[PDB]
């Protein structure tokens with residue numbers, strides 16, 4: 313398949329073509345799309361990636377090049393059939409994380425694009441520092457999350473991970489190695505952030521740091537009314553100057569059947585907690601339960617001072633009386649919480665299964681309309697495995713010059729919701745029902761005039777991508793022609809046909 317001359321290059325020592333190597337890069341976390349590459353490239357350095365891209369870009373028969381982080385995508389975005397998958401992890405041979413915490417300057421961490429957020433955390437904590445914004449799952453690459461946005465419970469306060477980047481090193485689709493920031497090569501910098509790997513491979517990101525907390529008081533608050541739940545989440549993300557507040561705000565939607573016919577316990581909830589929650593979800597007939605998840609960071613504070621701070625905050629809220637659930641953990645245990653959930657799921661054989669996931673950004677003005685059509689109509693009697701996340705964010709912390717898309721509103725409302733259907737098919741036979749629900753959600757939004765934006769989007773036609781990027785589409789197409797003229801990079805995104 314690949315050109316013969318590729319195997320004569322100095323980088324050919326890092327090209328793996330054995331079935332065992334290529335199979336490891338043929339599927340992703342979704343477990344639905346299978347497309348083996350011709351080879352897997354294991355670069356020792358970012359210059360090796362530039363040499364591979366340059367070879368393809370100057371060849372008679374250009375071939376696709378797709379960087380692969382952890383493969384935590386579910387629609388074949390990291391696959392390169394007919395091409396080469398770049399195993400980014402190879403760049404991590406030796407030391408790839410440098411923390412600059414010298415007195416008389418703003419501290420930062422330089423991390424390879426292949427580096428996992430869990431490894432960045434480990435390195436910065438040794439200096440009493442940490443990045444400000446985290447995804448829920450730390451075994452994701454820096455380059456992988458920055459190519460999307462990187463959202464989590466702190467984004468309402470500091471913006472997505474793409475809003476917490478000083479500069480990048482990018483290997484463009486021509487094989488050029490560019491350093492970019494707000495002040496130098498800003499067109500590439502803004503394009504690459506939420507850019508879905510279309511303009512180049514991120515090989516380095518300089519991440520913003522803040523003093524690290526030591527411990528976290530972590531709560532889940534149960535609500536039976538979506539209007540009360542949303543009013544409280546919006547209150548919690550809207551008093552950011554007040555000393556009484558959470559550092560992290562998320563939420564979860566638990567469908568009635570998912571509680572009643574669910575597990576005996578979870579890593580967060582005991583059997584007794586779950587028995588009480590099932591009672592709450594059926595007191596006046598069957599209801600879903602909406603949980604607010606809040607976390608309060610602290611350092612040297614005594615147990616009794618934290619109790620008082622949490623009480624002052626909880627005392628302002630309207631969750632069901634007697635339904636606060638509290639944990640007190642280290643900062644690392646809090647940020648790495650999903651690793652424990654993964655351990656439990658893998659032991660049950662419920663992790664390495666299909667994940668036909670769907671992530672939406674919904675305008676605040678339509679969130680109760682969304683709830684009515686999706687959770688109260690379409691999914692009221694559904695019992696999907698997995699989780700459903702629901703939480704609001706602030707548009708004022710997102711930079712709309714970056715590629716990443718947020719909902720557009722006529723009244724420029726600052727609040728929008730992230731709604732994530734993270735459902736899993738315990739059996740691959742459950743996939744069609746989940747995909748039918750995904751399409752039904754999108755169809756409901758279309759019929760209702762609810763102008764959502766998919767997050768981690770996937771479209772198989774340029775029409776879908778033109779609607780997704782809206783006002784930014786013309787600039788995106790122009791930057792694409794400049795930075796990846798042959799449309800070699802991450803072709804599994806399906807945004808640009810090969811010219």
Ligand SMILES: *Cc1cc2c(cc1C)nc1c(=O)[nH]c(=O)nc-1n2C[C@H](O)[C@H](O)[C@H](O)COP(=O)(O)OP(=O)(O)OC[C@H]1O[C@@H](n2cnc3c(N)ncnc32)[C@H](O)[C@@H]1O
Pocket residue numbers: 341378379380381382383384385389390391400425426446447448449452453454455456457459460461462463464508509510512513514515768802804805
């Ligand atoms: C599986 C998963 C995903 C996830 C999450 C929890 C789990 C269990 N929690 C998230 C969260 O709380 N918030 C959030 O913003 N995203 C969350 N995700 C999604 C995840 O961030 C993304 O799927 C992202 O792509 C990270 O994935 P990863 O490192 O595994 O990358 P990939 O799957 O292999 O590739 C995805 C696309 O990006 C391109 N790519 C990969 N690395 C690079 C670099 N360095 N430069 C440029 N492009 C890159 C791939 O080619 C592909 O198109």
Ligand SMILES: COc1ccc(C(N)=O)c(NC(=O)Nc2cc(Cl)cc(Cl)c2)c1
Pocket residue numbers: 448449463464650653654669671699701730732734768
């Ligand atoms: C697949 O197993 C689990 C189990 C628990 C969670 C959690 N508590 O957030 C978890 N969380 C996520 O996957 N979060 C996440 C996943 C994506 Cl794709 C997007 C966004 Cl905004 C959030 C996943």
